[PDB]
Each structure stands twice: as structure tokens, then as C-alpha cells.
Amino acid sequence: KGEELFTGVVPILIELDGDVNGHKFFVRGEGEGDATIGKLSLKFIATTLPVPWPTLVTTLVQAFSRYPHMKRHDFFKSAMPEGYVQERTIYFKDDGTYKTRAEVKFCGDHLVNRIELKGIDFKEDGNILGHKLEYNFNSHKVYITADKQNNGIKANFTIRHNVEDGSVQLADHYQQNTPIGDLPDDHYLSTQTILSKDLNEKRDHMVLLEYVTA
Amino acid sequence: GEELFTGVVPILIELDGDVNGHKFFVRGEGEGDATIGKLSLKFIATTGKLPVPWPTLVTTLVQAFSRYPDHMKRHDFFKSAMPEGYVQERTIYFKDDGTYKTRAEVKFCGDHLVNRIELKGIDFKEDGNILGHKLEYNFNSHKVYITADKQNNGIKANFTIRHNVEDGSVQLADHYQQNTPIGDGPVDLPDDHYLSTQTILSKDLNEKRDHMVLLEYVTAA
Numbered sequence: 531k532g533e534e535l536f537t538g539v540v541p542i543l544i545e546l547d548g549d550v551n552g553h554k555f556f557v558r559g560e561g562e563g564d565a566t567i568g569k570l571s572l573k574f575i576a577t578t579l580p581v582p583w584p585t586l587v588t589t590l591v592q593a594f595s596r597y598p599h600m601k602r603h604d605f606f607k608s609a610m611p612e613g614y615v616q617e618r619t620i621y622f623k624d625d626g627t628y629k630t631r632a633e634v635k636f637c638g639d640h641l642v643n644r645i646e647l648k649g650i651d652f653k654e655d656g657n658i659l660g661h662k663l664e665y666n667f668n669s670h671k672v673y674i675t676a677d678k679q680n681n682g683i684k685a686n687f688t689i690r691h692n693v694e695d696g697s698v699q700l701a702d703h704y705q706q707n708t709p710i711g712d713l714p715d716d717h718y719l720s721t722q723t724i725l726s727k728d729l730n731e732k733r734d735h736m737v738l739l740e741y742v743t744a
Numbered sequence: 745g746e747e748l749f750t751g752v753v754p755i756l757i758e759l760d761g762d763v764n765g766h767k768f769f770v771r772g773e774g775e776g777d778a779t780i781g782k783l784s785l786k787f788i789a790t791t792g793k794l795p796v797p798w799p800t801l802v803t804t805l806v807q808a809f810s811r812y813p814d815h816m817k818r819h820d821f822f823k824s825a826m827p828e829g830y831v832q833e834r835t836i837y838f839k840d841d842g843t844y845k846t847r848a849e850v851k852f853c854g855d856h857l858v859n860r861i862e863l864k865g866i867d868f869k870e871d872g873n874i875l876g877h878k879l880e881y882n883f884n885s886h887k888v889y890i891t892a893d894k895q896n897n898g899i900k901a902n903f904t905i906r907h908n909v910e911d912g913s914v915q916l917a918d919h920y921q922q923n924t925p926i927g928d929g930p931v932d933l934p935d936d937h938y939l940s941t942q943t944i945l946s947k948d949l950n951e952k953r954d955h956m957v958l959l960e961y962v963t964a965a
């Protein structure tokens with residue numbers, strides 16, 4: 531109950547109302563998802579960035595990860611279509627932190643993820659505000675655990691952003707997800723993500739390809 | 745239900761349509777402000793290219809965003825139906841051409857207001873104004889006449905859209921509308937009033953896909 535909504539391809543819409551150190555911004559994303567194979571394809575675009583796109587990549591539909599014998603362990607699919615609240619605190623080392631609250635749910639043929647991001651204490655002209663991050667993304671494993679207290683899931687992981695000079699900028703993620711309406715065992719999502727661009731696009735944008743499997 | 749439009753709320757529209765067999769899908773997204781009567785939307789055909797001119801889909805693609813003056817607040821059938829929502833049904837007769845049949849469910853889905861629509865266009869003449877794409881990319885000013893429908897605890901609407909044609913004439917589209925609430929509606933059925941509609945159609949320069957961007961102001965009277 532909830533698996534049938536991901537029988538094949540589903541249209542996605544992402545919305546992010548964000549500000550970092552005061553500089554408000556807005557990003558919209560559209561595209562499609564196929565939970566059956568674990569593929570995502572999206573075209574993000576800043577309609578208002580004071581911040582590099584890759585720091586926004588984790589926070590921008592985990593429901594689409596390919597779960598193999600683990601179908602009921604899928605908190606993300608089973609909370610559908612009521613949805614879940616995903617809350618995160620992202621601390622970037624020796625630099626600022628983002629706070630995000632997002633509501634992921636279904637709305638017609640569409641699956642939607644509403645985000646409000648607020649970023650604070652960022653060093654001016656550090657790796658993030660000085661834009662020293664490479665326009666790319668690496669592969670990571672996120673560890674999902676069960677949370678009996680609020681009938682949901684906790685997650686812990688660290689993102690390794692590659693920096694233009696050759697060093698690395700770490701981003702500690704702390705995550706909590708709880709359902710909107712009406713527990714899975716310790717498992718992992720391994721993520722692979724490509725960031726690119728479209729040739730004839732003068733607007734600020736991100737082209738995103740993801741493969742995530744449980 | 746008024747409290748749901750205290751300020752700006754995000755909108756999503758879903759349109760599944762086929763005209764004379766030609767299937768399409770339009771998704772729209774944007775923002776609405778009932779306090780000023782403003783709508784700002786960017787629609788997009790995800791099925792590729794529309795077999796139909798954009799202006800003919802404009803009345804079909806959220807009247808809950810129309811600005812009622814304070815003294816008519818209880819007369820706003822659309823807002824009082826929230827968040828349960830209402831069903832909107834229309835029959836559109838185009839003079840010298842086909843007819844649209846539409847059914848939509850307008851309701852809330854989280855912080856969002858969503859308009860889910862399924863349209864069927866039929867008996868449209870090959871080489872007419874519509875399938876022949878002779879319609880100007882713009883939109884005129886109209887008044888929709890709303891009456892109370894005691895029969896189904898809802899409202900009827902009557903109006904005609906005046907479509908400008910590329911060569912210099914106008915193409916008429918008689919609209920027939922009936923709205924019924926999903927839950928408890930308004931505490932009273934509204935008296936005869938009209939919405940004055942004003943609409944701008946434009947394009948985004950950077951967008952190579954088939955799209956339209958819409959700006960609307962609707963106020964009651």
C-alpha cells in the first residue's frame with residue numbers, strides 16, 4: 531500500500547524557498563522519476579544563486595531509491611501518498627549551516643517536495659559563499675535507522691564536496707523524517723549523481739541525474 | 745476558508761487532454777495572492793507540443809484567487825469551499841467549431857492549492873481557427889456571470905470568451921459552467937455577481953519548450 535503509485539514513470543515538481551546569510555533565493559525543478567529502476571531526471575532553475583548549486587543537491591525525493599525483499603522497509607514509499615516531513619541540519623565544516631524542513635507528498639499525477647531552507651553563519655568568500663566548489667558531485671552512503679519515538683526514521687551521513695584547488699569540503703548531515711498520516715531495519719542508500727548543463731540556457735540552472743539504490 | 749488565503753500560496757495545475765484524438769499534458773506552476781487578486785503562472789506541455797492553441801486552454805487552467813471586496817467575503821463560494829474544495833464542470837462551444845468538455849477538482853494539498861483537470865475536445869474542424877492555429881497569442885477582458893444553484897448547493901456561470909484571430913477578427917467561445925462543493929460549502933448561497941477578468945499571455949525567452957506564462961487580475965463586483 532503505496533508501492534503501486536510507483537509502477538512506472540511519475541512526474542516530479544520541486545520547490546525551494548531559501549536564504550543563506552540574508553541573500554534570499556528561489557529554485558524550481560521539474561522532471562520525472564522511475565522508482566522501479568531507481569533513476570531520476572530533473573532540470574532545476576533559479577527564478578530569483580549566492581550559493582553553489584552542489585550545496586543544494588542533498589536537500590532538493592528519496593522515495594525513488596530502488597529497493598530490492600525490502601519493500602516494506604521502504605519508509606519513503608510506504609508513507610505515500612500522505613507523505614513525510616524530512617527535516618535536516620547540514621553543518622559545513624569550519625563554515626556555516628543550513629536548516630531545512632521539507633514536506634514530500636503526492637498531489638495528483640505529481641509527486642511534490644516542498645522545501646524551506648535557511649542558512650546561517652557562512653564565512654564570506656569561504657568555499658561556499660566564495661564559490662570555490664567544483665560543479666560536480668560524488669557517491670555516498672546514507673545510513674537509515676528506525677525512530678520509535680516519533681514513528682519515523684533517522685539518518686546520518688557526510689557529503690564530500692570537491693573544491694576547485696584539489697582539497698575537500700565536508701558537510702555533516704543530520705536527518706529526521708516523520709510521516710504525515712499513518713518500522714524498517716537498519717539499511718543504506720548508495721547514491722550516484724551527475725550535475726550538468728543545457729547548451730542554450732542563459733538562466734541559472736542545474737541538470738541533475740541520479741541513481742540511488744537501497 | 746478565508747484564513748487559507750491570508751497571503752501568497754503556491755499553485756499546481758494538472759491538465760490531461762485530448763482533442764480529436766491528439767493527446768497532451770500541461771503542468772503549470774506558480775503563485776497566487778487572493779488579497780490583490782493576482783495570479784502568476786508558467787505552463788508547460790510535457791507531451792511535447794500542443795495540438796491546440798494556448799489561449800483556448802486559458803479558461804480551463806483556480807477562481808479561489810479572485811479578489812472579493814471585504815463586504816462580499818461570505819459570497820465567495822470558491823474560498824469558503826476550501827480546503828475541502830469544489831468540482832468545476834464546463835461545456836465550451838466554439839462558434840463554427842468543436843466543443844470542450846472539462847471536469848476539474850480544485851482543492852488544497854498541503855500548503856499548495858491544486859487544480860486537477862481532465863479535458864476532452866471533440867468535433868473540431870480540421871483547418872478551423874483552433875486546429876489551424878489562427879488564434880492570436882493574447883487574451884481580452886471578460887465578465888463571468890455567477891448565479892446561485894440551490895439545486896446542487898453550488899453556483900452556475902455563463903460567459904463568452906472573445907478570442908482574437910491572427911488576421912484581425914474575433915473567435916467566440918460560449919462557456920457554460922457549474923461548480924458544486926466537495927464538503928460543506930458556503931453558509932449561504934451567493935447572490936448574482938460577476939468576476940471581471942483580465943489576463944496577460946507572454947513567453948519566457950530562455951525556454952525552448954512549448955509553454956505559456958500567464959498574468960491575471962480578477963476582482964469581484
Ligand code: NI
Pocket residue numbers: 760862
Ligand atoms: Ni489521465
